[PDB]
From a paper:
Parechoviruses, including *Parechovirus A* that infects humans as well as *Parechovirus B* (formerly Ljungan virus) and *Parechovirus C* (formerly Sebokele virus) that infect rodents, belong to a group of picornaviruses whose 2A proteins, instead of being proteases, contain a conserved H-box and NC-motif and are homologous to a small cellular lipid-modifying enzyme (PLAAT3) that acts as a host factor, enabling the picornavirus life cycle. Despite the common evolutionary origin, 2A^H/NC^ proteins and PLAAT3 have no conserved function, as the active site of the viral proteins cannot support catalysis. The C-terminal α5 region, which is a unique C-terminal extension so far only observed in *Parechovirus* 2A proteins, clearly plays a central role in determining the order of oligomerization as well as other correlated and sometimes far-reaching structural rearrangements.
Intrigued by this observed disorder in the C-terminal region of the *Parechovirus B* structures and its apparent influence on protein oligomerization, we decided to extend our structural characterization to the H/NC-motif type 2A_2_ of Sebokelevirus (SEBV1), the sole representative of *Parechovirus C*, which like *Parechovirus B* 2A_2_, exhibits shortened N- and C-termini compared to *Parechovirus A*. The structure of SEBV1-2A_2_ was determined to 1.56 Å resolution in space group P2_1_2_1_2 with two molecules in the asymmetric unit and was refined to 20.16% R_free_, no Ramachandran outliers, a Ramachandran Z-score of −0.40±0.53 and a Molprobity score of 1.16 (98^th^ percentile) ([Table tbl1]). Overall, SEBV1-2A_2_ is similar to the LV 2A_2_ structures (3.70 Å over the full chain; 1.2 Å over the core 97 C_α_ residues), in SEBV1 however, the C-terminal α5 helix is well ordered (and extends to include two of the extra residues past the native protein boundaries) ([Fig fig1]). SEBV1-2A_2_ assembles into the same overall dimer configuration as HpeV1, despite having closer sequence identity with LV-2A_2_ ([Fig fig2]). In SEBV1-2A_2_, the C-terminal helix α5 folds back onto the globular domain, which positions it close to where α2 sits on HPeV1, and α2 shifts ∼7.5Å away from the interface.
Numbering used by the authors:
A (entry chain B): -4 to 141
B (entry chain A): -4 to 138
Amino acid sequence: GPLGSPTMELVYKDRGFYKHYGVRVGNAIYHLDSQDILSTAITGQATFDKIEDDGCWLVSQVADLDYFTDKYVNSLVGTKHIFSATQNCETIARDVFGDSSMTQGRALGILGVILLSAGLLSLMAVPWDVSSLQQVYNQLTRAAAS
Amino acid sequence: GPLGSPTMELVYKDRGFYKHYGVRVGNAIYHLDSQDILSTAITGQATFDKIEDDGCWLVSQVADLDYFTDKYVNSLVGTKHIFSATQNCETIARDVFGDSSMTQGRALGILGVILLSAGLLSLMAVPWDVSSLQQVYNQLTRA
């Protein structure tokens, strides 16, 4: 089902070792501004930026991705997250989620869930159907020592 | 090369979709206490714990992994990292690195880099030889 506002498009660039997702709204693309996904994870700091579409992004079929992302949207509602934004992201909540009452902060958290979920699932080559997504989610939430 | 003390081993359990890594010293295993890497990444909070070996861990051949992990350790020396630990890990520096003078924080940063690197590189199906690792390093860091 839908991830956000009526015109938001999940897009990506294929960087070979990983696919890098963003969201396109009109000619604006919102995405994480660093390719160093390992540094991002280790430091707990990720910054969104808004860029112009360069014509080189591909569109993702969203399929049932929301089944998976909703689990984290719900589970990390009252939880500090790692996402900040540049000054160019003033209207991200409205653009991406269609909700002017949502704070920028809350929008960054939800969008960061979506983009990291898409990127991780792509790395795992997991299709975005409910069955496949539930299977991955079960392994992610399995007790670490088990 | 070696990643730590002379008896330290890189170990994992295979979850199919990914491998969950830890480091072993004797029958003590130090690992992240959640394998929900999304929650870990989104919240910027990873907690090490120390468990007993159940005999069901596999040993990784480390090859040249330290070539890659050392680069990240060196980049994040004067840099906050996300790794904390339960109190069971008070002796991780002496156990894992063989250095009682090393701070717990420094030990956790190094081991966190190693475990996340191993996990990510495995997902990428990258040989842990220097040439392969230099190629993915260059892509990650935009050199």
